[PDB]
């Protein structure tokens with residue numbers, strides 16, 4: 001049995017999971033759900049199935065792995081990471097992992113909040129004002145380490161990468177002030193299975209968000 | 219030396235952390251920060267200090283424990299839980315923990331979203347329409363277990379409790395359709411250190427949210 005990863009036919013919250021899945025070399029298939037166009041943005045393809053998957057808190061994404069039925073993107077992430085020693089070894093490694101796990105989710109919500117907000121264009125200047133600061137925190141937090149946890153790559157590297165990439169897309173010249181972060185993107189995309197996957201026809205970098213979006217809905 | 223827990227002089231995101239601190243018998247003080255009144259809810263008392271605490275991602279709440287400086291409520295929670303074997307033993311225990319860790323965070327966000335929304339009064343009927351459903355998921359998820367992880371109490375029990383309590387305070391009869399959840403509230407408040415603490419002058423059940431709020435700002 002391969003694992004099933006369920007999600008909308010977009011990037012969204014599955015990106016880190018897909019990347020992690022590939023990096024770990026895990027047998028799996030995606031169950032992609034399509035969303036209708038305006039003004040309903042019909043979701044019945046997912047809603048017809050939402051409550052019949054034995055999920056405890058029906059949501060997307062979800063991962064199904066035989067008996068284990070998982071929701072909550074970070075939960076899927078640590079569940080997979082655990083099978084391959086990537087949830088962090090030492091105590092220091094774990095702290096950093098717990099922080100970044102939630103820190104990235106926050107910066108992600110924040111991006112997604114405006115990109116789904118009809119006011120998108122007016123909010124953008126302020127969000128761009130503050131971006132440099134957000135990225136500085138990551139840069140300083142990474143410091144001279146090869147990975148965010150420390151010396152070993154871990155699943156939060158996938159979360160941090162996704163967030164950084166997203167912004168390089170949103171604001172091309174948004175990483176230049178931080179060599180080490182650009183080095184991080186190199187290392188990560190330089191990883192063999194990551195590279196191979198990025199070249200494959202499975203890669204799915206866009207849409208970034210669902211159709212409801214004002215930006216990256218395309 | 220005692221640990222410092224920093225947060226607004228409210229309940230908010232610290233409630234689970236306070237409860238957990240007491241239950242584990244942890245040695246700690248609070249650094250409480252006050253917020254100004256309308257219409258600029260000044261936050262300089264925290265802002266004057268925000269960047270000088272050696273925090274990696276300055277935020278509230280934070281926990282300071284000698285060399286370890288932590289942010290992100292869930293990270294503080296697991297960090298403490300680990301010192302006392304409460305982040306989950308088995309694999310099944312961990313999955314459940316990871317899920318609820320994020321699941322509660324979501325239902326909390328959701329509540330906090332409308333209670334901070336000026337439109338509070340119009341949004342309320344719709345939120346109460348779904349008020350139950352959400353609770354049903356918890357009830358079914360708990361099932362016949364004494365705790366949400368399984369047979370051992372763990373730190374998510376604190377998160378789930380807070381969320382259930384918050385709603386009972388918002389929708390009294392919002393827990394009648396689910397005996398087992400009321401039993402959970404019994405067990406939890408029935409815990410000795412919990413009970414003692416709830417009677418102490420340290421107990422801080424309100425305000426629920428910051429002053430900016432339309433509900434539970436009082």
Ligand SMILES: N[C@@H](CCC(=O)N[C@@H](CS[C@H]1C([N+](=O)[O-])=C[C@@H]([N+](=O)[O-])C=C1[N+](=O)[O-])C(=O)NCC(=O)O)C(=O)O
Pocket residue numbers: 012013050058059060061071072073074108109110112113116208209210320324
């Ligand atoms: N915290 C959960 C996220 C759960 C969630 O909201 N999932 C959304 C898509 S995320 C989506 C999003 N995005 O596309 O990146 C981000 C957006 N946002 O504000 O950041 C919220 C989303 N949304 O529209 O629901 C969903 O479709 N749930 C199925 C259901 O409820 O039936 C997790 O990490 O798994």
Ligand SMILES: N[C@@H](CCC(=O)N[C@@H](CS[C@H]1C([N+](=O)[O-])=C[C@@H]([N+](=O)[O-])C=C1[N+](=O)[O-])C(=O)NCC(=O)O)C(=O)O
Pocket residue numbers: 102106230231268276277278279289290291292326327328330331334426427428
């Ligand atoms: N993900 C972090 C969230 C940290 C956070 O958002 N803290 C807010 C207060 S939470 C607050 C809230 N509440 O009080 O319960 C809930 C609300 N919400 O929508 O859920 C968001 C809040 N807010 O006002 O930002 C803050 O004051 N940050 C300090 C800073 O950034 O300088 C965590 O879990 O610790």
